[PDB]
Design an enzyme around this catalytic site. Structure first.
Site, PDB file in Angstrom:
ATOM      1  N   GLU A   1     -69.228   5.081  63.440  1.00 62.63           N
ATOM      2  CA  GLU A   1     -70.302   5.431  62.509  1.00 62.63           C
ATOM      3  C   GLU A   1     -69.785   5.983  61.172  1.00 62.63           C
ATOM      4  O   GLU A   1     -69.010   6.949  61.136  1.00 62.63           O
ATOM      5  CB  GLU A   1     -71.243   6.429  63.183  1.00 62.63           C
ATOM      6  CG  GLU A   1     -72.189   7.235  62.296  1.00 62.63           C
ATOM      7  CD  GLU A   1     -72.973   8.261  63.101  1.00 62.63           C
ATOM      8  OE1 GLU A   1     -72.577   8.551  64.246  1.00 62.63           O
ATOM      9  OE2 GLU A   1     -73.981   8.789  62.594  1.00 62.63           O
TER      10      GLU A   1
ATOM     11  N   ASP B   1     -71.197   7.897  58.186  1.00 62.03           N
ATOM     12  CA  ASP B   1     -72.308   8.655  57.615  1.00 62.03           C
ATOM     13  C   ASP B   1     -72.116   8.814  56.119  1.00 62.03           C
ATOM     14  O   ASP B   1     -71.452   9.743  55.652  1.00 62.03           O
ATOM     15  CB  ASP B   1     -72.465  10.010  58.314  1.00 62.03           C
ATOM     16  CG  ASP B   1     -72.941   9.865  59.735  1.00 62.03           C
ATOM     17  OD1 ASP B   1     -73.801   8.993  59.989  1.00 62.03           O
ATOM     18  OD2 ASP B   1     -72.478  10.627  60.602  1.00 62.03           O
TER      19      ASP B   1
ATOM     20  N   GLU C   1     -75.970  12.317  54.686  1.00 58.04           N
ATOM     21  CA  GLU C   1     -76.832  13.170  55.493  1.00 58.04           C
ATOM     22  C   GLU C   1     -77.146  14.364  54.608  1.00 58.04           C
ATOM     23  O   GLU C   1     -76.235  15.066  54.175  1.00 58.04           O
ATOM     24  CB  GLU C   1     -76.114  13.616  56.758  1.00 58.04           C
ATOM     25  CG  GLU C   1     -75.742  12.458  57.661  1.00 58.04           C
ATOM     26  CD  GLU C   1     -75.355  12.908  59.031  1.00 58.04           C
ATOM     27  OE1 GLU C   1     -76.271  13.159  59.849  1.00 58.04           O
ATOM     28  OE2 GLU C   1     -74.137  13.019  59.284  1.00 58.04           O
TER      29      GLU C   1
ATOM     30  N   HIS D   1     -66.984   8.910  61.274  1.00 58.54           N
ATOM     31  CA  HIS D   1     -66.712   9.304  62.653  1.00 58.54           C
ATOM     32  C   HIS D   1     -66.131   8.077  63.353  1.00 58.54           C
ATOM     33  O   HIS D   1     -66.624   6.959  63.157  1.00 58.54           O
ATOM     34  CB  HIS D   1     -67.984   9.661  63.431  1.00 58.54           C
ATOM     35  CG  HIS D   1     -68.825  10.745  62.838  1.00 58.54           C
ATOM     36  ND1 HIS D   1     -69.127  11.902  63.528  1.00 58.54           N
ATOM     37  CD2 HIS D   1     -69.501  10.819  61.667  1.00 58.54           C
ATOM     38  CE1 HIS D   1     -69.922  12.657  62.792  1.00 58.54           C
ATOM     39  NE2 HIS D   1     -70.163  12.023  61.658  1.00 58.54           N
TER      40      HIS D   1
END
Ligand SMILES: *[C@@H]1O[C@H](CO)[C@@H](O[C@@H]2O[C@H](CO)[C@@H](O)[C@H](O)[C@H]2NC(C)=O)[C@H](O)[C@H]1NC(C)=O
Ligand SMILES: [Mg+2]
Length: 440
Positions: A214, A216, A219, A230
């Site tokens: 993932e 990101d 956020e 991640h």
């Protein structure tokens, strides 16, 4: 899961852009699909619910396979039920959408490809991704997220015999939290040891989680923002159980890195950079540019650096530099940065342990799906993003302070009651070569 036919599924249209060297961008007809967890789930008809609130119908779902065989995901009323709407190139995701018999909290959608059946696949290495965001309606405790996950283009349609729904119905979600709240994983209902949550009437957890790499990209709420790769030691969407899911107590035992290697400007020691009336002013719309740099600047180079630029009121804003004691100056994510910050903050370096940016870039090579969402945090009240975390730690210990929100902010029940009309607008999505998505 099967396909429900009670209600037609029409993905809200969204215009995005593809850019070329020199800055010329063209528009592209795309659309968005609601994640399958939010959908009405029922029999072919005679129509009875297979699931309601946080419980299953045991007669229709005596085991995971029979459940998948008997149970159909239906179409969604995007605006009226889920608070999702699009206009031109802008997606609006509303936080709380009330109804006569239930309340919908948050949403999660995926960008569909040109065929409106499979997810759009992004190949991010040696590329730049841009979008505009307005977070004026996202207070403490909320998260408007834009990110990428290593989902199958068809959401598991071809991989799993008993998934007959696929990406058209938003199946196959995975991420590095290895969520066990997912109702269908690998074409089987996640009912083994199903436990209705005692603090969330909308959620339960089963034996299995759904894990994958993932990125990101974003956020954030009005107060604070993080950009966080991640990684996992598995390739693509993978079902976990037991310690591999790294649930609660065994957080750092599983197959994916739950913390990620994060860059939050406030956490990295610059409290004046991003927020209301700050250098990047979150009271207004702004552009977020993310560059995925390789070792030799080619598409086959190892992913080596993730850079960030902002654009607001016509001005290009360079990313903030790190300002942490004993720590060197970085303004971007490198494996070097990740080693330094995990050490400086006393955090377990799972990101690097599981292969770091090399493994992230390898996920990009396979391909990633664009996710947009709005949510509150039943695990940690969004404190990790916008407050002091852990709350038991000294607020002056490096890494603890991530924003200005109170340690008592972001309790789901509280934010749903007090801030139901919160929303995020993502717009003007662009992909292309480094330097192509924005004006200097
Ligand atoms: C937080 O980031 C801002 C933005 O980069 C910094 O403000 C800049 O400071 C530099 C000095 O290095 C100067 O070039 C400019 O005067 C500032 N730029 C802008 C756009 O305001 C600020 O120094 C950072 N704060 C800390 C504590 O590092
Ligand atoms: Mg199938």
């Amino acid at each position: 899961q099967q396909v429900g036919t009670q209600t037609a599924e029409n993905h809200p249209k969204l215009t995005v852009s593809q850019c070329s060297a020199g800055g010329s961008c063209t528009t592209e007809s795309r659309s968005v699909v609601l994640d399958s967890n939010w959908r009405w789930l029922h029999t072919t008809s005679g129509t009875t619910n297979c699931y309601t609130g946080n419980t299953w119908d045991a007669s229709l779902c005596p085991d995971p396979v029979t459940c998948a065989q008997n149970c159909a995901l239906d179409g969604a009323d995007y605006s009226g039920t889920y608070g999702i709407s699009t206009s031109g190139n802008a997606l609006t995701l509303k936080f709380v959408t009330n109804g006569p018999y239930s309340t919908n909290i948050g949403s999660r959608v995926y960008l569909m490809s040109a065929d409106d059946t499979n997810y759009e696949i992004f190949k991010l290495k040696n590329q730049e991704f841009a979008f505009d965001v307005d977070m004026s309606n996202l207070p403490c405790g909320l998260n408007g997220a834009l990110y990428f996950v290593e989902m199958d283009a068809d959401g598991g349609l071809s991989r799993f015999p008993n998934n007959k729904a696929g990406s058209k119905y938003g199946t196959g979600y995975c991420d590095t939290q290895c969520p066990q709240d997912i109702k269908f994983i690998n074409g089987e209902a996640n009912i083994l040891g199903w436990t209705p949550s005692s603090s969330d009437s909308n959620a339960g957890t089963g034996q299995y989680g759904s894990c994958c790499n993932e990125m990101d990209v974003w956020e954030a709420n009005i107060n604070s923002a993080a950009v966080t790769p991640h990684v996992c030691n598995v390739q693509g969407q993978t079902r976990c159980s037991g310690t591999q899911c790294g649930d609660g107590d065994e957080r750092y035992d599983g197959i994916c890195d739950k913390d990620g290697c994060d860059f939050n400007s406030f956490r990295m020691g610059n409290q004046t950079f991003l927020g209301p009336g700050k250098t990047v002013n979150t009271n207004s719309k702004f552009t977020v540019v993310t560059q995925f740099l390789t070792s030799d600047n080619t598409t086959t180079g190892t992913l080596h650096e993730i850079r960030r630029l902002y654009v607001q009121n016509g001005k290009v804003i360079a990313n903030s530099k790190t300002n942490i004691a004993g720590m060197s100056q970085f303004d971007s994510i490198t494996d070097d940065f990740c080693n330094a910050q995990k050490t400086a903050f006393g955090d377990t370096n799972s990101f690097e342990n599981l292969g770091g940016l090399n493994v992230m870039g390898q996920a990009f090579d396979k391909g990633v799906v664009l996710v947009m969402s709005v949510w509150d945090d039943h695990e940690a009240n969004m404190l990790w993003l916008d407050s002091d975390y852990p709350t038991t730690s000294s607020a002056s210990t490096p890494g603890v302070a991530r924003g200005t929100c109170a340690t008592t902010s972001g309790v789901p029940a509280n934010v749903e009651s007090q801030n139901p009309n919160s929303s995020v607008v993502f717009s003007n999505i662009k992909i292309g070569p480094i330097g192509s998505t924005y004006t200097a």
